[PDB]
Write a protein that binds this ligand. Structure first.
Ligand SMILES: C[S@@+](CC[C@H](N)C(=O)[O-])C[C@H]1O[C@@H](n2cnc3c(N)ncnc32)[C@H](O)[C@@H]1O
Length: 327
């Protein structure tokens, strides 16, 4: 579809009646270090991606019943589960995380995060991109649209989190590798992954129910959680609704991630350990995932100005999304 100017994009933003909506107030504002045991996390594991890691197709649990790959799947799963028992027992892989909730308001395509409820001092800004193609009856989405504009005078909030399956991940895989045991070496990385992702599901649930607290009586099964049948979203930088990776640096700063979990970001803004998940929390009932997709040169120059970066640095990071021939 033909791109649109940034201005026409911004003119077709998410239309909602803010004067008639009262965003839910965050019950626990602030930053809180969190933890979760392997035992608790196992109830939140989505196993389908583990089987796909072992090049097996099929969705858990039906996959355990496949007359051809069923038996290999059952072996994998049994070994998966005995290793979990062992890391659980020996406390050798320890999931760590941090979560935070903040007063926030939308100004343009960005989200201002305030030091407190007087909302007079911006401690950080969460920058976002807006879809830049001609949209038919649908707004040109930007994640900032799901937070109340500062102009509406409504108090709103945003949350963030960073979780890891454990800082031991490499020590464990490194040891399986030294003795040429690539099976378990894969096994331990595949599990740390499931655990990181389980912790993100579990923590999002605690946020919906207690920390932000807008859905205190929520009672979803793990399959309902996997189907995302809850109110709200937890977009992660790097994913399609927010493809710009350097924003992981804002989360690291807001939650003081390294100080509270030992998790670090690299030169290309990847997270260490490898089994880690970071992102934002949005409470709006209408929030959803989508792809920003191809963005034009006017959006790149504006984004660079807001971020305080040169247009070429922004070109490096948004390269998969430039809707024009970059250089
Ligand atoms: C990666 S899966 C994780 C849950 C799944 N059951 C699993 O275990 O893999 C879905 C997650 O990816 C991120 N995500 C997916 N689509 C996204 C989008 N379009 N924009 C931003 N983040 C997105 C969100 O953090 C979301 O919770």
């Amino acid at each position: 579809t033909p791109p649109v100017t940034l201005e026409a994009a911004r003119d077709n933003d998410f239309a909602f009646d803010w004067q008639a909506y009262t965003p839910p107030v965050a019950h626990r504002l602030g930053v809180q270090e969190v933890e979760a045991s392997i035992e608790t996390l196992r109830n939140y594991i989505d196993w389908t991606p583990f089987f796909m890691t072992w090049s097996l197709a099929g969705k858990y649990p039906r996959i355990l019943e496949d007359e051809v790959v069923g038996v290999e799947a059952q072996r994998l799963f049994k070994d998966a589960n005995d290793m979990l028992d062992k890391l659980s027992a020996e406390k050798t892989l320890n999931p760590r995380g941090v979560v935070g909730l903040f007063p926030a308001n939308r100004v343009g395509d960005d989200i201002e995060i305030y030091r407190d409820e007087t909302r007079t001092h911006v401690i950080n800004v969460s920058h976002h991109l807006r879809q830049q193609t001609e949209k038919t009856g649908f707004a040109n989405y930007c994640l900032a649209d799901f937070v109340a504009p500062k102009l509406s005078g409504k108090a709103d909030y945003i949350g963030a989190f960073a979780v890891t399956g454990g800082l031991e991940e490499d020590a464990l895989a490194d040891a399986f590798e030294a003795q040429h045991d690539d099976y378990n070496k894969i096994m331990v990385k595949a599990l740390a992954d499931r655990l990181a992702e389980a912790f993100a599901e579990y923590l999002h649930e605690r946020v919906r129910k207690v920390y932000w607290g807008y859905a205190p009586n929520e009672n979803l099964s793990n399959e309902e959680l996997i189907r995302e049948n809850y109110q709200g979203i937890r977009p992660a930088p790097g994913y399609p609704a927010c493809p710009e990776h350097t924003e992981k640096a804002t989360i690291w700063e807001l939650l003081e991630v390294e100080k509270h979990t030992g998790m670090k970001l690299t030169e290309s803004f990847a997270m260490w350990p490898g089994a880690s998940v970071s992102g934002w929390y949005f409470s709006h009932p209408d929030s959803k995932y989508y792809a920003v997709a191809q963005i034009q040169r006017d959006q790149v120059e504006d984004y660079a100005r807001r971020k305080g970066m040169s247009v070429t640095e922004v070109e490096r990071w948004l390269a998969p999304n430039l809707g024009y021939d970059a250089d």
